[PDB]
Amino acid sequence: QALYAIDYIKNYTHGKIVKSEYWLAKMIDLFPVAKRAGVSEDVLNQARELHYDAHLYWEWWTAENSVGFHNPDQARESLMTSISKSKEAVSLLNDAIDAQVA
Amino acid sequence: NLKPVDAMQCFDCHTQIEDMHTVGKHATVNCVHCHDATEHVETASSRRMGERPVTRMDLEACATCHTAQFNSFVEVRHESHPRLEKATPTSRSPMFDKLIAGHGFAFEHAEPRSHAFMLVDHFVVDRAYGGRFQFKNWQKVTDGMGAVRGAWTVLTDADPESSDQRRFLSQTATAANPVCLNCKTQDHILDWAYMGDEHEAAKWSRTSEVVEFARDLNHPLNCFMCHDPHSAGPRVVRDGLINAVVDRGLGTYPHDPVKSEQQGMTKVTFQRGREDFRAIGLLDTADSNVMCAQCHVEYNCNPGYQLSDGSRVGMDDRRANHFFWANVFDYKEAAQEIDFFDFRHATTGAALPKLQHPEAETFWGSVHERNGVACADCHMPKVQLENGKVYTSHSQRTPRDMMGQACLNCHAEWTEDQALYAIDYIKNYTHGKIVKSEYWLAKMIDLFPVAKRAGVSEDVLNQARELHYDAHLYWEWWTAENSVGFHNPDQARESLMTSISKSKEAVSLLNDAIDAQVA
Amino acid sequence: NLKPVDAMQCFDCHTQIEDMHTVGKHATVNCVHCHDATEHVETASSRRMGERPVTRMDLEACATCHTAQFNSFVEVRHESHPRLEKATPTSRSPMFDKLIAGHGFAFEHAEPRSHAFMLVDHFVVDRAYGGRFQFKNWQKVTDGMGAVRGAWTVLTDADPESSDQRRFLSQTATAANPVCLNCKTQDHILDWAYMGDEHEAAKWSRTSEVVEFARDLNHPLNCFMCHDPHSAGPRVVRDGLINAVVDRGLGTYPHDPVKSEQQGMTKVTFQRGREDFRAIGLLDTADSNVMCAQCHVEYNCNPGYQLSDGSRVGMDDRRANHFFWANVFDYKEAAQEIDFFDFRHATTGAALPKLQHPEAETFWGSVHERNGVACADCHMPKVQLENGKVYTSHSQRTPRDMMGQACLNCHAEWTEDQALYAIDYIKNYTHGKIVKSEYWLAKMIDLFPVAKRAGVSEDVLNQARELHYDAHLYWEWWTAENSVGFHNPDQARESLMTSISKSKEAVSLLNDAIDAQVA
Amino acid sequence: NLKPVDAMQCFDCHTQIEDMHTVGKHATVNCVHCHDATEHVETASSRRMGERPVTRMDLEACATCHTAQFNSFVEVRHESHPRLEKATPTSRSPMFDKLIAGHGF
Numbered sequence A: 001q002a003l004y005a006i007d008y009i010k011n012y013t014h015g016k017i018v019k020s021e022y023w024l025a026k027m028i029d030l031f032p033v034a035k036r037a038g039v040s041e042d043v044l045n046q047a048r049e050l051h052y053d054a055h056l057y058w059e060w061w062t063a064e065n066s067v068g069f070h071n072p073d074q075a076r077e078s079l080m081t082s083i084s085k086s087k088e089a090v091s092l093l094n095d096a097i098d099a100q101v102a
Numbered sequence B, C: 001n002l003k004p005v006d007a008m009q010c011f012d013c014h015t016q017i018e019d020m021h022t023v024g025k026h027a028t029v030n031c032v033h034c035h036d037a038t039e040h041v042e043t044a045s046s047r048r049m050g051e052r053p054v055t056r057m058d059l060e061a062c063a064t065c066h067t068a069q070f071n072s073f074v075e076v077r078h079e080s081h082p083r084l085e086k087a088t089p090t091s092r093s094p095m096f097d098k099l100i101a102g103h104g105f106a107f108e109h110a111e112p113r114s115h116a117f118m119l120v121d122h123f124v125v126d127r128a129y130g131g132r133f134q135f136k137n138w139q140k141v142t143d144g145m146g147a148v149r150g151a152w153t154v155l156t157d158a159d160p161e162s163s164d165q166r167r168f169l170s171q172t173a174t175a176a177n178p179v180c181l182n183c184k185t186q187d188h189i190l191d192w193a194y195m196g197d198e199h200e201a202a203k204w205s206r207t208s209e210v211v212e213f214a215r216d217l218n219h220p221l222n223c224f225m226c227h228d229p230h231s232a233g234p235r236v237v238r239d240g241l242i243n244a245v246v247d248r249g250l251g252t253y254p255h256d257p258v259k260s261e262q263q264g265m266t267k268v269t270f271q272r273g274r275e276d277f278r279a280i281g282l283l284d285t286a287d288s289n290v291m292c293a294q295c296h297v298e299y300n301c302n303p304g305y306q307l308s309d310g311s312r313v314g315m316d317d318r319r320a321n322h323f324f325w326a327n328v329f330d331y332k333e334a335a336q337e338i339d340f341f342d343f344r345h346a347t348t349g350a351a352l353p354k355l356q357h358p359e360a361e362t363f364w365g366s367v368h369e370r371n372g373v374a375c376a377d378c379h380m381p382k383v384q385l386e387n388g389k390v391y392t393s394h395s396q397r398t399p400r401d402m403m404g405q406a407c408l409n410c411h412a413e414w415t416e417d418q419a420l421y422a423i424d425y426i427k428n429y430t431h432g433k434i435v436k437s438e439y440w441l442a443k444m445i446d447l448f449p450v451a452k453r454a455g456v457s458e459d460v461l462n463q464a465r466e467l468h469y470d471a472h473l474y475w476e477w478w479t480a481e482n483s484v485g486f487h488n489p490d491q492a493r494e495s496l497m498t499s500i501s502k503s504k505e506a507v508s509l510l511n512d513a514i515d516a517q518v519a
Numbered sequence D: 001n002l003k004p005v006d007a008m009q010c011f012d013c014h015t016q017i018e019d020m021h022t023v024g025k026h027a028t029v030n031c032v033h034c035h036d037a038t039e040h041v042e043t044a045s046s047r048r049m050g051e052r053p054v055t056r057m058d059l060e061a062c063a064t065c066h067t068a069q070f071n072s073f074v075e076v077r078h079e080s081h082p083r084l085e086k087a088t089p090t091s092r093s094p095m096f097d098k099l100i101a102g103h104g105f
């Protein structure tokens, strides 16, 4: 039962780490597309400021060795923040790329 | 200490109950075991309820005389890893996020775990109630007996003062609606009209505030979902299943008219104010294929859209509670027949179906189903005892935990290791094809933004969107279905090869169109 | 399928059953579960039975609603070695044949095995029925479930055409009599008057032909031996126990009047033809010490002789069914009170008692008993489940199989190995003193022929015979008692040292007398 | 907490202890680990003990620096059956009582 409780936390936290990486990677891959579409430096810098937070609130948890066990609610709150920041950056870059195309 | 009541008094007004109770194996089981009807008897007339009697829906109402079945049911399989997200490289669908983008399952989709947790897990998953409900703390995740005693003994509500569906944490969704609950509990069996239609006698319906409905529900997988409490005979209570088998006349085995007649269902209807209200389906035999198909099917339990015009199909529409009752190769036709799809893909814009755990429809026509084997033979077998009264295990779990009973009694030519090896050959092969189907789907999906930004025509994009529907269907069936192909290995193989073919066709169409724009 | 009967009509005549049934936890359990009384009800008056109703005594009558308890009871402990003779160097009493010579136990006395087998084992042991009964073949010795279904489903009778007790093989005895069966079954509970006295309404009594009685009996350890079937409350049914505790006013705990009052017994009597016929003892609490003391006691269930004049005491005498209800240090006085001994030693000629399994009387005053611990805590503990409804294990066996529940919940300071080590320290020490007691008894016994042949006086031989009674009693208690000292280690030690002291005194007396004849 | 004593002063009288202690692998192990000799040192001469010093004989006096050896020593072998009489048919000397008769064993 105690092992099961550990694994519930690690499995849930790891799922959110994987989703945070999915969204970070999606954002990262838009940077070359945005650059080559002629998106402004202003927009790219806005996305770069979001990248700082998206990265921080993800990497803390790959760096930290308990896969959330040491503080499961904090891991959850942080990783949801990571995904939110990446999603914000993805929307910003997608819109800017689309405006360049139009 | 219970004091028996005179059932003859009840039978004067309750003739269907009389006919069921006096004939079956609960003829000696007094009403007081499950009903407190003292004030009801004082106030009822032959057509008016008067004071509403209390009906026990707790599983302990059955555990008093059937402890073995109850204990076997409530056992927690700790090897069924809990809260394990499927959209990870080590689980069922490594590319699920890219493929399902636009759907609420992107917020969380874990592997299933033991039946004791079905209602609490429904309440706490990130896709359901915006994170409103949590276990009281992270220790309570272990407590199967507590969940069975009642969801609200182990859960907390972030805001008991409001009843709206809303996000309490950012990366959650509010996908839950009242139809979901029919596959988690039947505590509401006397408060919900058939199909969840509006009804004067129904407290709850498809259009209810799901947070309010949730608060009224407690027990998972009530024992009476498969066993009539009055006759003790085999049955189903799930409205969607009765509707498919009986109302639409599709039969218990749609591919086999003979087996459908031998192993059929009889719809029994109960009225309120002499108007049809609720129904059950009595089974000709104790047929676990049909009992388990109350939940282990592909369904609608959600709003969606019409394929014809793209218009919203809300919870008020009968189509929001629907059993397609169709195998993977008949599903597209079944969705067209009700003019329905689930979501638009976030990247491709394609109208897509959402598939959920179609074990029953996958099992049809398979070698084991054709040889008269049923879910219970592999997942809840008879217990083998050197000296003891045999009973049926109710711990519905993988046969790996009980291979002697689940497989080897039939397969005398095999050792346990050989039978496990045969399972793994099928799962490994099917999983390889699922991964390849996802590779090709992802390759197609990633071409949509390239095509859009290259100025590829809407005509070509719509052609690719029509292919996406099929590529998705013929892949997702198998990530949704829990056997990783074991239940029907040839069908999985044929379907997943179809998925890859459709994606490849779309990839070629988009690549050519992009290249023509460049030239 | 059972159809319920009108219990209110039965209650018009059966007022004691009404008072018990309507109040307890079987108030909703219809009479048809255990009685077929259709013709009885048609023909009876309050003063005439009419047609005799059928009463079910099979354990399946309870297993229908209490499968967990039934299955735990019927389980066979294969580690309890079967048919293992105690008069061997590797068992409990290496010198038993020399010491018991003259008694029927010399023909066979095996170690106990699982409760499922008690009636079949009684029937087939070499000392009981002259070898008349056997298992159908040597495979059937494993079949606990079969024995529980009924003895005659698994046994054969060498001569169904005769009903006399006789030898069918040379080295057997015919010690069985109707009193024995009271500790093997209660199938005869409605056919046996209290104590086995003669009674117009009793088919069977102490003086019946035991072979005929045997053929009418089927089930071991009926569930209702400890649980009233009408109230479901705790009870005993064994006449000899009710006689000691209630009739003779000894109390449930003869050494503790306070505990005797708190944990007492109420005698309930049932009549035939308005004369007392049978009785039960309702317990104030669910006290397994007293439930198990229906059988795990020292008793008379046999003919014997008077200590006063040596005259025969036959089965017709009340003393042939007797619970002494006395500890080892009170037993000689208890036997003097009824003027009774069992056998004359074949070699020494001494009047001797025969002791049987005095677990209940040994447990009194021990550290565990004084701390409120009871047999069930160590031998029938509550089951421990991660998720499940708790019930009481009915597999009445050594705590070695379930040390976590039987010992370690109380003894938190110990590991399983430490607790086992403490058991073994006691058993090893006690067994060593049993072996030394047998050494000295055997030395004494072997001097009797030497003394007789040397012309030693009858007066000296009689003084030695008096010492033999004590030397025997204070040894045999502990080969009879099954815990090898664990139940009361200080009492075992004190008693066994008394045995050795007595034997040493007799050896000295005889050696001196022999030496004086030679001089 | 132990406070070390001046071992050189002890050696002014205890020359055999000096020769053993200063040469071996306990040369750095202070006397206070095993002796309380405060009043002894105050009252003794080379020819009179004075107050008798206390000497520790408990095994914990060594376990402080040699826990591994102490723990290996104190372990109970539960498989070495306890209180098992040898004069029984299943032990070492089945006929011991007859053969040893007259002896306390």
Ligand code: HEC
Pocket: B005, B006, B007, B009, B010, B011, B012, B013, B014, B031, B035, B037, B038, B040, B041, B044, B045, B046, B047, B048, B049, B052, B053, B054, B055, B190, B271, B272, B273, B274
């Ligand atoms: C006629 C006067 C009645 C007697 C006597 C009993 N009941 Fe009844 N009951 C009656 C009516 C008219 C209704 C409304 C439904 C209908 O058939 O028209 C009911 C309802 C129930 C229910 C359902 C309650 C719910 O929550 O929906 C139950 C469980 C019920 N009744 C049980 C019951 C029992 C156990 C009785 C004997 C003690 C009994 N009823 C007497 C009419 C009458």
Ligand code: HEC
Pocket: B025, B026, B029, B030, B033, B061, B062, B063, B064, B065, B066, B223, B224, B227, B229, B231, B232, B233, C064, C065
């Ligand atoms: C004791 C008072 C009971 C309560 C409460 C419940 N059941 Fe029962 N059940 C009971 C008996 C005595 C029997 C007959 C046993 C036999 O084999 O003769 C039954 C039977 C069942 C069966 C088997 C029916 C069949 O094979 O036709 C089932 C599936 C069953 N019972 C289920 C059940 C459920 C789900 C209950 C809670 C709603 C329940 N029983 C209560 C005794 C008692």
Ligand code: HEC
Pocket: B108, B109, B110, B111, B112, B113, B121, B122, B125, B127, B128, B175, B176, B177, B179, B180, B181, B182, B183, B294, B295, B296, B297, B298, B299, B300, B301, B302, B356, B357, B480, B482
């Ligand atoms: C019966 C037709 C069902 C309806 C309607 C709903 N669910 Fe379900 N659910 C069902 C089964 C048979 C299973 C187990 C098999 C599987 O593939 O998981 C489930 C599982 C869940 C789980 C646990 C796994 C997970 O995805 O995290 C949750 C959280 C869950 N179901 C939630 C849920 C919601 C929110 C529903 C309405 C939108 C819903 N379920 C409907 C059967 C059925």
Ligand code: HEC
Pocket: A002, A003, A005, A006, A072, A073, B137, B138, B139
């Ligand atoms: C006593 C010194 C403890 C040790 C060692 C461990 N845990 Fe614990 N745990 C302890 C307390 C007092 C609490 C809070 C209890 C409460 O109800 O207030 C907990 C909490 C947990 C939880 C829940 C955490 C949450 O965030 O809600 C879990 C899952 C948990 N403990 C598990 C656990 C495991 C696996 C341990 C060994 C690695 C462990 N705990 C050590 C007390 C103590």
Ligand code: HEC
Pocket: B059, B062, B063, B066, B069, B070, B073, B221, B222, B223, B224, B225, B226, B227, B286, B287, B288, B291, B292, B376, B390, B391, B392, B393, B394
């Ligand atoms: C459907 C998913 C089921 C639920 C929920 C419950 N049971 Fe069940 N039960 C099920 C099957 C398929 C069978 C075997 C039928 C066959 O004949 O092959 C059973 C059997 C019973 C029985 C009969 C005795 C036995 O075979 O063990 C009893 C008494 C019974 N089940 C009780 C029971 C209880 C108390 C439940 C809630 C804990 C329960 N069942 C749920 C299918 C289903």
Ligand code: HEC
Pocket: B080, B288, B289, B292, B293, B296, B359, B360, B363, B368, B373, B374, B375, B376, B377, B378, B379, B397, B398, B399, B400, B423, B427, B482, B483, B486, B487
């Ligand atoms: C034996 C011939 C089977 C029959 C009949 C059914 N299923 Fe099955 N199932 C089977 C296997 C070998 C597996 C894989 C188990 C493993 O450990 O690899 C499965 C899997 C499931 C699962 C997922 C179980 C899990 O991963 O823990 C579910 C939910 C499941 N099966 C349900 C199910 C239903 C509803 C059936 C009747 C329609 C059914 N199975 C038949 C073997 C067999």
Ligand code: HEC
Pocket: C005, C006, C007, C009, C010, C011, C012, C013, C014, C031, C035, C037, C038, C040, C041, C044, C045, C046, C047, C048, C049, C052, C053, C054, C055, C190, C271, C272, C273, C274
């Ligand atoms: C009065 C008209 C009676 C009714 C109604 C019932 N019984 Fe009876 N019973 C009656 C008598 C006079 C006797 C003889 C014993 C006595 O009390 O003097 C009995 C006996 C029984 C027995 C014992 C049979 C035996 O083997 O000794 C049983 C088990 C019994 N009765 C049960 C019973 C039941 C279940 C009834 C309702 C269906 C019932 N009896 C009605 C008098 C009367």
Ligand code: HEC
Pocket: B064, B065, C025, C026, C029, C030, C033, C061, C062, C063, C064, C065, C066, C223, C224, C227, C229, C231, C232, C233
């Ligand atoms: C189902 C029709 C039953 C039959 C046949 C038997 N018993 Fe029973 N028993 C039944 C119920 C519903 C209950 C109450 C459960 C509760 O906890 O509320 C009982 C209870 C008992 C008990 C406990 C009594 C107490 O704690 O006071 C015992 C010891 C018991 N039952 C024993 C028993 C025996 C020996 C039976 C065969 C003669 C038997 N029961 C039949 C349901 C049913």
Ligand code: HEC
Pocket: C108, C109, C110, C111, C112, C113, C121, C122, C123, C125, C127, C128, C175, C176, C177, C179, C180, C181, C182, C183, C294, C295, C296, C297, C298, C299, C300, C301, C302, C356, C357, C480, C482
């Ligand atoms: C209750 C007071 C009893 C009476 C009367 C009889 N027996 Fe018994 N028997 C009893 C118990 C509690 C035990 C188990 C503990 C033990 O010391 O064995 C037994 C055991 C047997 C056995 C099996 C062991 C053996 O000796 O081979 C047999 C064969 C047996 N009992 C036979 C028997 C006979 C023939 C009796 C009447 C002369 C007799 N028993 C009476 C409890 C009681």
Ligand code: HEC
Pocket: C137, C138, C139
């Ligand atoms: C098949 C080639 C067999 C092998 C190998 C073993 N046994 Fe057997 N056994 C066999 C038969 C056909 C019979 C007679 C069956 C009948 O009901 O007529 C038996 C008998 C036994 C018995 C009963 C002996 C008696 O004298 O009544 C026992 C206890 C038994 N067998 C056990 C046994 C064991 C332990 C074996 C492996 C060493 C074994 N048998 C081999 C068939 C065969």
Ligand code: HEC
Pocket: C059, C062, C063, C066, C069, C070, C073, C221, C222, C223, C224, C225, C226, C227, C286, C287, C288, C291, C292, C376, C380, C390, C391, C392, C393, C394
């Ligand atoms: C005396 C030697 C017993 C016999 C024979 C049977 N049971 Fe029993 N039972 C016994 C004890 C000491 C207890 C526990 C009492 C306590 O509260 O500590 C029980 C309990 C039961 C119960 C209650 C539920 C539970 O605790 O498990 C039931 C339903 C019960 N027993 C049933 C039962 C049946 C069916 C038996 C025949 C197979 C049976 N008991 C025999 C003591 C004795």
Ligand code: HEC
Pocket: C080, C288, C289, C292, C293, C296, C359, C360, C363, C368, C373, C374, C375, C376, C377, C378, C379, C397, C398, C399, C400, C423, C427, C482, C483, C486, C487
């Ligand atoms: C725990 C404190 C105990 C209580 C209370 C009772 N007994 Fe016991 N018993 C106990 C032990 C440790 C042992 C030795 C077991 C071993 O494996 O070494 C025993 C032994 C028995 C036996 C013989 C069992 C066997 O050898 O398989 C019997 C028949 C027995 N005990 C009965 C018994 C009765 C009737 C009690 C209440 C009066 C009783 N025991 C109390 C531990 C405990």
Ligand code: HEC
Pocket: D005, D006, D007, D009, D010, D011, D012, D013, D014, D031, D035, D037, D038, D040, D041, D044, D045, D046, D047, D048, D049, D052, D053, D054, D055
């Ligand atoms: C001379 C002035 C001394 C000094 C400085 C110390 N000790 Fe001594 N000790 C002395 C004498 C004359 C004796 C009597 C024995 C003898 O050799 O004639 C002792 C005895 C001890 C003993 C043994 C005590 C016993 O129980 O027998 C010990 C352990 C001892 N002495 C230790 C000791 C230590 C540790 C000193 C330094 C702190 C020390 N002694 C000083 C004479 C003198």
Ligand code: HEC
Pocket: D025, D026, D029, D030, D033, D061, D062, D063, D064, D065, D066
């Ligand atoms: C710490 C303050 C110590 C106390 C108290 C004791 N001993 Fe010791 N011991 C200590 C050290 C630092 C060493 C040398 C380690 C090395 O290998 O360099 C020792 C050595 C031993 C030895 C080995 C001697 C040899 O191989 O020549 C033994 C046998 C020994 N020690 C035993 C011992 C006993 C029995 C003690 C209690 C009277 C004891 N030591 C105290 C450190 C410390």
Ligand SMILES: O=S([O-])[O-]
Pocket: B013, B014, B015, B016, B017, B018, B270, B271
């Ligand atoms: O019997 S029911 O239909 O009231």
Ligand SMILES: O=S([O-])[O-]
Pocket: B356, B357
């Ligand atoms: O959402 S449920 O169908 O898995």
